[PDB]
Amino acid sequence: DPAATADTVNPGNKIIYLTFDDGPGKYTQGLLDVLDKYNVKATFFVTNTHPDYQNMIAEEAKRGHTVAIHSASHKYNQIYTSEQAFFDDLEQMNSIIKAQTGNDASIIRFPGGSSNTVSKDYCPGIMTQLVNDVTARGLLYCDWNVSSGDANPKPISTEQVVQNVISGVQSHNVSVVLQHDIKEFSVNAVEQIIQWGQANGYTFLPLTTSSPMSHHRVNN
Ligand SMILES: [Mg+2]
Ligand SMILES: [Zn+2]
């Protein structure tokens, strides 16, 4: 029930929240350098899939970005077998974020989105329970309303990612863009996306606890 949660703060008009899933990884440092070049803050929904880059979580926070939870294991067949397994994994990821940044996470992004149906193969009904359990735990969750197309099993070109994000943003006064910073071709699109947005009156912001969240329909 939306009635039970605090109002969010209107962020203004022509807003873009660039967000990045599945990292950190080998391309994250380069992405941080690009964001610094344009003085833009973003949001990272992190995993422990590539623990050789775990210190990038500390760097993301140090540089002013929002560090949020995606999943420690990012294994659907583990985290979606029970509420208990999901939160064991979520807590492991939060603990790494605390170790690295000094702070707990406040925001999460469910693997597959809150709208995913892959979780039906492991626990029917679990997403309906988890959106309520995450809320009861004082956590916020965010899906997205602009696809970059960078999740396709066959990669698209950097130029196609640029065009996908620029065209999707124009559909929304307030956009939450999904990219994955573990994909080199998609990271390499971010510079042109920022150039275009800044030249067209858009403001890039990081997600915070007072931001409006983007929520999909829950399908499981
Ligand atoms: Mg329960
Ligand atoms: Zn993911």
Enumerate residues with CB within 5 Å of ligand 2 (an ion). 21-22, 111
* 34 CB neighbour count, 10 Å cutoff: 17
For ligand 2, the distance from its centroid to the CA atom of residue 173, given in whole angstroms, is: 25
**SS3 of 131, please?**
helix
Q: Which CATH number does the domain housing residue 87 bear?
A: 3.20.20.370
> Is 70 assigned a ligand-binding role in the annotation?
yes
CA triplet 75, 81, 87: central angle to 5 degrees? 75
Report resolution in angstroms.
Answer: 1.5
Q: Which of 119, 165, 118 is nearest to 145 (CA)?
A: 165
User: How far apart, in whole angstroms, are the C-alpha atoms of residue 30 and residue 40?
Assistant: 14
> Is 89 assigned a ligand-binding role in the annotation?
no
User: In the chain, how many domains are there?
Assistant: 1
Any residues with CB less than 8 A from the CB of 139 and at least 6 apart, and which? 105, 106, 107, 108
For ligand 2, the distance from its centroid to the CA atom of residue 62, given in whole angstroms, is: 23
What was the structure determination method? Answer: X-ray
User: How far apart, in whole angstroms, are the C-alpha atoms of residue 8 and residue 88?
Assistant: 29
**Which residues span the domain enclosing 185?**
1-220
User: How far apart, in whole angstroms, are the C-alpha atoms of residue 21 and residue 178?
Assistant: 7
For ligand 1, the distance from its centroid to the CA atom of residue 57, given in whole angstroms, is: 30
DSSP string covering 189-215: THHHHHHHHHHTT-EE----TTSPPP-
Q: Are 118 and 168 in contact (CB under 8 A)?
A: no
Q: Are 69 and 109 in contact (CB under 8 A)?
A: yes
